[PDB]
Each structure stands twice: as structure tokens, then as C-alpha cells.
């Protein structure tokens, strides 16, 4: 029971190896029988070899008999059964072969007895048609010959030692005992020579009998295992295996059609590089198969791509010859891979390759920094140039993430490119180009944001991140050093780049990652205030919405009341908003009157000031300066006149909404009054009238903004306002208007559910520019999402959302996610009414079909097929999933039956029902999901039918037949 002893938890593998050695010394036949029985029961054959049947009759008929006597209960074999107990079985099996053959290498392995039978049986079973026998025999003989390779290595070392001692004696001819030692060494050398010849004989026998047959085998895993292990051997025994005689098989196997075999080929090739260099035949094969290696860089499997990139890195360690510049740019594009390990491997290769200004990839004192503020400048320089040439990305986020861990020491040396950006270093280089300036600033944005937060961006995200102590302490002192460095650098950074809008927008994302109590410890609030005045100059010099958003977000980050500086920053915030209030009042009180003219200058001043006010009012409570009077006067004169720019109205509407929501903030504070409550409700009602007028206004972005503002107003006054333990907010609650609901539905249908260019309510996007179709599609998805969010929270009538549910196939790619989620949520809110509106959606589509085609309805057309497919996916959306499972199905069936006989035919004939093809739609909802309620639904169905309708069975009433 050596199979069971090795399998079922062997305490010491060398112990049973020595037991087999002792039994072999006792009697060769019984130990050979035990080893053969072990191998056969390792093959999955439950037959047991006996003494006479092993001794007398040959191995091929043994193989035939055990094929007949396999005695299976399943097709599985011990190399593929689930895991644990069998995994450690396989490991024990391999270790038993290795230790058993390697331990006998001194005296037992030259008896010329066991290996003949073992080789014959294993070769025959590797030529056997049974996959189990082939796999098990290949593994057994494969570990056998691996052990024989180790024995050959030991014999070669012994030959080297005895040759050295023979030459050492041949130096010294003095001594008769020395001559006797020389003759003993010669006899030992001859014994080792004949032992080596025998080992070579069994080596060649096993090789030409097994490996040549089984690397052409139809099983991928046998070839993969063979190639991986042959690379292991050629890594460890390069004396005889490092030649083309074994590399021809590797070259032939590199073109395998299976990913795992090629993975093992790349592992073998890396084993030729790891960890020793250099060999000429290795570089010859590298230059021979550079094209195949770069082919595997773009393989389907991510693992094969990673191994190919690592082999390329190994070649760069060893050769620097075979790789071409186009291959280099291919890997530079692989830096932008979606899969993070591939990108990180490519970035590590890039760091190894293109960074040799003063680092020779060698020892220090000239490699990291030469004690000056200059050596690392050129590394920064081809970072900038690489970002310039990499036109596959406007941002170096993926590039920096790939180059993060490989260049950790280089990416924290922010002071170096800081002097190479602002203060004109002593290197005598050219002027820092504006495109290069923006590229370097984008690189800094990426590097410091990855310095603060360590999570990779979206697509590279994992969510299974754990922070070690080293990680968190590196994060903290990294935060400290960036804080103290950049509170110094940002003042003259802004002073150099005040007028550059995009550079300011990029630079003001870092202060989200600044520990503000360090200012209290560092006493650098004065530099904070200098940067506040500098960004005040930017704000008063820039009118861009994006930079105002960035500034407002930066202020909100530094408006952290948990830090002492909140008063000091609130000084500057109040000062700047007070300036903007004064400027807004001065400009508005002259713009609202007609006068002369109003010209473009006053329009520009009003628009810029209101942009700034709206932007800084989004993130900050500024209702102490009640400018809703000016904004509402501007909105009402926009209503009355209508001849003035769009953006001013957009800014006024958004600023008024911001004021309203900031007032809404300070009523849930536990102190609600009533006079200001009614005042706020009246202002909200006026804002609702203005928003309805703007929705009726001809301008379509104004229509969308009015729609989303109305969405915000309705969710503010939604039914879930009463959830959070509120009592006095009940007067504030305002119900939707049915005409307003119809206007909203009409707007949504005219401006959302469009997938063609015929409507012309969606901007073109044909040219692959910043004005692509994707922006319009995502904006329409956002508007539909806001509308559905109003729908699902008991605010607006969801019979209007039935018309949204009906568009699930015409807009599957565009809005199928939104329609499916809305249907699921409305099912979770009220499944009965959800099913009623679902069958209403089907009725609406069917009535559109009635309008388009008439009462014949074209029952075999694509429209009916699409409606029936929609019915199928709706029926599988139901079932036993929520409460009132079949009651909703019964209600849907009753509604469908009512609709199928809703209209009666005037001519030809009275009993044929119009809208009969809806029974085909309902037949998908009947199917076989239910069984007991089918009788009740049929009883409801037969109320509208007659016996004359029962008896007729033709093409017109085929929907009725299919439903019944």
C-alpha cells in the first residue's frame, strides 16, 4: 500500500524512500513490484500488479490489461481531481520519485536492473492511448530523468575533482604511495567515466523514447510541463543542455496554439536569462525570436504579456541588441494598458531603459545625485519629452501610475523640476517651453496625487486595499514634506503662471491633500495668505468656469472649521465675496435699465461677476449677502424681454438655486421659524415659475438647466422630506402640477430618447473631437437619470415612466441600463403598479404599431418580434422574486386581457377582436411560470370571449390560440 502510504499523509518522505531502499537490498523483485504498484495506482488504475505477472509477461500487455482493468467509477484521474488531498498527493508523488532516484545515485543506480523495466513501462504508458496513463507516466519518467540529470551533474563534478587530483599527483612524482594514489585516482576516474556513459545511455533512451514523442502530443498540459521543466534544467545544467540540440524543441514549441504552453515557454526563456549572464547562444536565440517575443507581448493572455515584457527586461539586462525602436514604442503604448500589472511591467522596463543621464545602473556617488541641484534634470527632461510624444493621452495618470513604484525616489524629488520650472537653473538650457511647462505641471499633478492617495485610478481599481504601517508612515511623512515644500513653491509658481488658466486649474488640486495643522505647527499662515491674495488676483483676472470651480473647491477644502486657520481664511473669503457683491450690484443696477445700450462691456462684467458669485456660492454659505433680489430681477427681466445672453441667465438661475439650497441648509439645524419659512416657500415658488418659463424658453441648454433645477426643487419637496424626523416642514411641501408633468415628459421625449441624427436636438459628434457624441449621450443619460430619480421616489406619476419603460429595445445600448434599473426599483417600490405600467408600456408600443400599420398589424414583422422579445425579458424579470409574486402577474394578465378586447371590429367581423396581437405579448407572460392561477386567468379571459370565438381556429386568431 505504498500508494496509500505516500498519499494519506506521509510523515517523512525520505523515511519511506529508505524503506524502499532497504526492501530493494533485501530483494529486488518485491521492491520493484511495490514501486510498479505505486505508479499504477498513481495512474488511477485500481488493479494491482502481482509477482508473477510482473516478472514473466511483458509491459505492453500489462498496459493493455490495465487499460481493460482500469475499473473506473468516473472519468477523472488523480492528476485532475479537485484539489487539497490530491494536490498534496501529487506533490508527494513527485517528491517520492525525486528523492528515491536521487538517494540511490552512489551504489544502487549502477546495478542495471530497475531502470530497464521502469523505462520500458513508462515509455509504453506514455505511448498509451489513455490520457491518464500518458500524463502519469510522463510525469513519473520526467522526474526520473530530472533526477538522472542531477546524477549526471554530480558525476561531472566528481570527474572534475578526480581529474584535478590526478593532475595534482602528476605534478609530484615523488613517492611510491603517491603513485599508488595516482593509480587509485585513475581507477576512480575510469569508474566515473563508465558511470557517466551509463547515465548518458539512459538519458538518451528516456529522451528519444518519451520527450520527442510527447512534445508533439495533442495534450497541451504535457507539453507545457515539459517545456517549463526543460527550461528549469537548462537553467541549472548549462554544461550539456545549453545548445541548439535542445533549443530546437523550444523554438518549435513557441508557436503553440495554447496560452499555457506559451506561458511555460516564456518561463523557460526567462530561466535562460535568470539569473546569469552572458552566453552567446542565448543572444543568438534572442535575435532569432525577437519577433516571436514581441508577438507574445501582444498575446491574448495577460500572463503571457507580463512574462514577455519581463523577458524583454531580461534581454535589456543582458543584450540591449535585438529590440528595435518600433518595439520600444509598442511597449511605450503598452504603458497605457488598462491592465495594471502589464502597464507596471512596461513602465519598469521604460525606467530601466531610458534613464541613463548620470545613473549607469550601477553603484552610487554619481548615480542618484552628485551632491548638486543639477544631475536629475535630464531624467525630468525626457519624462517631459515622453509625455509630449505620448499623444495617446492628454494626462500622464496611467504613465505615472506605471512609473510609480519603479521610480519612487525620483518622483519625490520635487525641488529639482521646481527650479527647472521657475527660477532658470545654472545648466544653461533653453527656456522652459509653455507646452513643456503644461506637461511638467500635469506630471506633477499626477505624481503628488498618487503620493497622497495610493489607490490606482478607475479601471486599475481593486478595492481590496490594506494599509501596512510602512505604507501609512511613508504616506504621512510624504504629506509633511510636500506640505512644507509646496507652501513655499506655490506663491512664485502662481506669480510665474497667474494668467495660465489650465495651469492654475491643475495646480489647485494639490491643496486638497494638505494637512492644515502643519500650518499651525509650521507657522506659515502668512504664506497661506500670500497665496490667497495671489489666487484672488487669478480669480479677478480669470473668467473661466473651470478655474472658478477649482478655486471654489480649493477654498472649501481650506474652509475646514476643525482647523484653527478657519477665521484667517474666512477673512479673505468674506473680503473677496464682498468685493464681488459690490461689483455685481454696481453692474446689475446699470444693466437692468435699458439705457445705452446695454453694450458688450457691461454684459461681460455682469456675466463674469455672476460666474464668480455662483461658483463661490456653490461650495460656501453666502446667503448673509442676499443677492436673490438682483438675481430674481435679472431672471424676471429675462422672462419679459428675452433678448440678452444665455450664460447670464444660466448663472443667475444656478446662483438663485444655490441661495435657496443654502437657506435649506439652515432650517434643518434644529431652529426652524415660520415667517422666514413662508418667505422661503414664496421665493421657491417664484423660482419654480421662472424655471417653468425657462423650460418653455426656446433655448435648449436653458431647457436642460431648467429641467435639472426643477428636479432639484421637486426632490427637495419630495415625500422623503418627512423621513428624517421632521414636523414643521409640512407647509413647505409643494405638489407637482399635471401640466408641468406633461411638459417634463414632452421635454424628456424630445431631448433624451433619440438615437438618430434626424431629430437635430443632439449635437453632431461625427468628428472625433472634444465635441463628440459621447458628451451628448452622457448628458442625456444624466437627464434621464434625474427624471427617473424623481419617478422612483413617489414624486411624479409613473404612468409617464411607462413611456420610458417602453423604449427598452429602441434604446438598449444608450439607456437600457437606466430603463432596467428604473423598472427594478419601481418593482421594489410597488410591484403591482410596476407590472401595470409595464403592460401599459407594451400597450403604448402596440398602439404606436396600430397607428403605423393599421389593424392588420403585420404580426410577422420586426416590430411584433421586438415587442414579444420585450415581453419575454419582462416575464423573466418577474417570477418569485418579491412580495405579491403572482398577484402582480395576475393583474398584468387581467390588464392585457382587457386591452386585447378593449376595441371591437366594425366590419369583418363582429367577433374578431382588434388589438388581438397583444395576446401574443401576454402569452410570454403566461408561458409555464405559474400553474394554479392559470385557471383563474383563463376564467377572466373567457369573459370577453364567446363560443363562436372559441370554435374558430385560423390565422387572424392565432394570437388567441397561442395565448390559450
Amino acid at each position: 500500500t505504498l500508494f496509500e502510504v505516500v498519499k494519506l499523509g506521509k510523515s517523512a518522505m525520505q523515511s519511506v524512500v529508505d524503506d524502499w531502499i532497504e526492501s530493494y537490498k533485501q530483494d529486488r523483485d518485491i521492491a520493484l513490484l511495490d514501486l510498479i504498484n505505486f505508479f499504477i495506482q498513481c495512474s488511477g488504475c485500481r488493479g494491482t500488479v502481482r509477482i508473477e505477472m510482473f516478472r514473466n509477461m511483458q509491459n505492453a500487455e500489462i498496459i493493455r490489461k490495465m487499460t481493460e482493468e482500469f475499473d473506473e467509477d468516473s472519468g477523472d484521474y488523480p492528476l485532475t481531481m479537485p484539489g487539497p488531498q490530491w494536490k498534496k498527493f501529487r506533490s508527494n508523488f513527485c517528491e517520492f520519485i525525486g528523492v528515491l532516484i536521487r538517494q540511490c545515485q552512489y551504489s544502487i543506480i549502477y546495478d542495471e536492473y530497475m531502470m530497464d523495466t521502469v523505462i520500458s513501462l513508462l515509455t509504453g504508458l506514455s505511448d498509451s492511448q489513455v490520457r491518464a496513463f500518458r500524463h502519469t507516466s510522463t510525469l513519473a519518467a520526467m522526474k526520473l530523468m530530472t533526477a538522472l540529470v542531477n546524477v549526471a551533474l554530480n558525476l561531472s563534478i566528481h570527474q572534475d575533482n578526480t581529474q584535478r587530483q590526478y593532475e595534482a599527483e602528476r605534478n609530484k612524482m615523488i613517492g611510491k604511495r603517491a603513485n599508488e594514489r595516482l593509480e587509485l585516482l585513475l581507477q576512480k576516474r575510469k569508474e566515473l567515466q563508465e558511470n557517466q556513459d551509463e547515465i548518458e545511455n539512459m538519458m538518451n533512451s528516456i529522451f528519444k523514447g518519451i520527450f520527442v514523442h510527447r512534445y508533439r502530443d495533442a495534450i497541451a498540459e504535457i507539453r507545457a510541463i515539459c517545456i517549463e521543466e526543460i527550461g528549469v534544467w537548462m537553467k541549472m545544467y548549462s554544461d550539456a543542455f545549453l545548445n541548439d540540440s535542445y533549443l530546437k524543441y523550444v523554438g518549435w514549441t513557441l508557436h503553440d496554439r495554447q496560452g499555457e504552453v506559451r506561458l511555460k515557454c516564456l518561463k523557460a526563456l526567462q530561466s535562460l536569462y535568470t539569473n546569469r549572464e552572458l552566453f552567446p547562444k542565448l543572444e543568438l536565440f534572442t535575435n532569432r525570436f525577437k519577433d516571436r517575443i514581441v508577438s507574445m507581448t501582444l498575446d491574448k493572455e495577460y500572463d503571457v504579456a507580463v512574462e514577455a515584457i519581463r523577458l524583454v527586461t531580461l534581454i535589456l539586462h543582458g543584450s540591449e541588441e535585438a529590440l528595435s525602436n518600433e518595439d520600444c514604442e509598442n511597449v511605450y503604448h503598452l504603458v497605457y494598458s488598462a491592465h495594471r500589472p502589464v502597464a507596471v511591467a512596461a513602465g519598469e522596463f521604460l525606467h530601466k531603459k531610458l534613464f541613463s543621464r548620470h545613473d549607469p545602473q550601477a553603484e552610487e556617488a554619481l548615480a542618484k545625485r552628485r551632491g548638486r541641484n543639477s544631475p536629475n534634470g535630464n531624467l525630468i527632461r525626457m519624462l517631459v519629452l515622453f509625455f509630449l510624444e505620448s499623444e495617446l493621452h492628454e494626462h500622464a495618470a496611467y504613465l505615472v501610475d506605471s512609473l510609480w513604484e519603479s521610480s519612487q525616489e525620483l518622483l519625490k524629488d520635487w525641488e529639482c523640476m521646481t527650479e527647472l520650472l521657475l527660477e532658470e537653473p545654472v545648466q544653461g538650457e533653453e527656456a522652459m517651453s509653455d507646452r513643456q511647462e503644461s506637461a511638467l505641471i500635469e506630471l506633477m499633478v499626477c505624481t503628488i496625487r498618487q503620493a497622497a492617495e495610493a489607490h490606482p485610478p478607475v479601471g486599475r481599481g481593486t478595492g481590496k486595499r490594506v494599509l501596512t504601517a510602512k505604507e501609512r508612515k511613508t504616506q504621512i511623512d510624504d504629506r509633511n514634506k510636500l506640505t512644507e515644500h509646496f507652501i513655499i513653491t506655490l506663491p512664485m509658481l502662481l506669480s510665474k503662471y497667474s494668467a495660465d488658466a489650465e495651469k492654475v486649474a491643475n495646480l489647485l488640486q494639490i491643496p486638497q491633500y494638505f494637512d492644515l495643522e502643519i500650518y499651525s505647527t509650521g507657522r506659515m499662515e502668512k504664506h497661506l495668505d500670500a497665496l490667497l491674495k495671489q489666487i484672488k488676483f487669478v480669480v479677478e483676472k480669470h473668467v473661466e468656469s473651470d478655474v472658478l470651480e477649482a478655486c471654489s473647491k480649493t477654498y472649501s477644502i481650506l474652509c475646514s472649521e476643525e482647523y484653527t486657520i478657519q477665521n484667517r481664511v474666512d477673512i479673505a473669503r468674506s473680503q473677496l465675496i464682498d468685493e464681488f457683491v459690490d461689483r455685481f450690484n454696481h453692474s446689475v443696477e446699470d444693466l437692468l435699465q435699458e439705457g445705452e445700450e446695454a453694450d458688450d462691456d457691461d454684459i461681460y462684467n455682469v456675466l463674469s461677476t455672476l460666474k464668480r458669485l455662483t461658483s463661490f456660492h456653490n461650495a460656501h454659505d453666502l446667503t448673509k449677502w442676499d443677492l436673490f433680489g438682483n438675481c430674481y430681477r435679472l431672471l424676471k427681466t429675462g422672462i419679459e424681454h428675452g433678448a440678452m445672453p444665455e450664460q447670464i441667465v444660466v448663472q443667475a438661475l444656478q446662483c438663485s438655486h444655490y441661495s435657496i439650497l443654502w437657506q435649506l441648509v439652515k432650517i434643518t439645524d434644529g431652529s426652524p421659524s415660520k415667517e422666514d419659512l413662508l418667505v422661503l416657500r414664496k421665493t421657491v415658488k417664484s423660482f419654480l415659475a421662472v424655471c417653468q418659463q425657462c423650460l418653455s424658453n426656446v433655448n435648449t441648454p436653458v431647457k436642460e438647466q431648467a429641467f435639472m433645477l426643477l428636479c432639484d426643487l421637486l426632490m427637495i419637496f419630495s415625500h422623503q422630506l418627512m423621513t428624517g424626523g421632521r414636523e414643521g416642514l409640512q407647509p413647505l411641501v409643494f405638489n407637482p402640477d399635471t401640466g408641468l408633468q406633461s411638459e417634463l415628459l414632452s421635454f424628456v421625449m424630445d431631448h433624451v430618447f433619440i438615437d438618430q441624427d434626424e431629430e437635430n436636438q443632439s449635437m453632431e459628434g461625427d468628428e472625433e473631437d472634444e465635441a463628440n457624441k459621447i458628451e451628448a449621450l452622457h448628458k442625456r443619460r444624466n437627464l434621464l437619470a434625474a427624471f427617473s430619480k424623481l419617478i422612483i421616489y413617489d414624486i411624479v406619476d409613473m404612468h409617464a415612466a411607462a413611456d420610458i419603460f417602453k423604449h427598452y429595445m429602441k434604446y438598449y445600448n444608450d439607456y437600457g441600463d437606466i430603463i432596467k434599473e428604473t423598472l427594478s426599483k419601481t418593482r421594489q417600490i410597488d410591484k403591482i403598479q410596476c407590472a401595470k405600467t409595464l403592460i401599459l408600456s407594451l400597450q403604448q408600443l402596440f398602439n404606436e404599431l396600430v397607428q403605423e400599420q393599421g389593424p392588420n398589424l403585420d404580426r410577422t414583422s420586426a416590430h411584433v418580434s421586438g415587442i414579444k422579445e420585450l415581453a419575454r425579458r419582462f416575464a423573466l424579470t418577474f417570477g418569485l422574486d418579491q412580495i405579491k409574486t403572482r398577484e402582480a402577474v395576475a393583474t398584468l394578465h387581467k390588464d392585457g386581457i382587457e386591452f386585447a378586447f378593449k376595441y371591437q371590429n366594425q366590419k369583418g367581423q363582429e367577433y374578431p377582436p382588434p388589438n388581438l396581437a397583444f395576446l401574443e405579448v401576454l402569452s410570454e407572460f403566461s408561458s409555464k411560470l405559474l400553474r394554479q392561477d392559470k385557471k383563474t386567468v383563463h376564467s377572466y379571459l373567457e369573459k370577453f370571449l364567446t363560443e363562436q370565438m372559441m370554435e374558430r381556429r385560423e390565422d387572424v386568431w392565432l394570437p388567441l390560440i397561442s395565448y390559450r
Partner: peptide
Amino acid sequence: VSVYDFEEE
């Protein structure tokens, strides 16, 4: 290069 020319069977 001629040893790597596959002519087996």
C-alpha cells in the same frame, strides 16, 4: 541554421 530545419518523418 540547417539543424533547426524540421524534416522529421
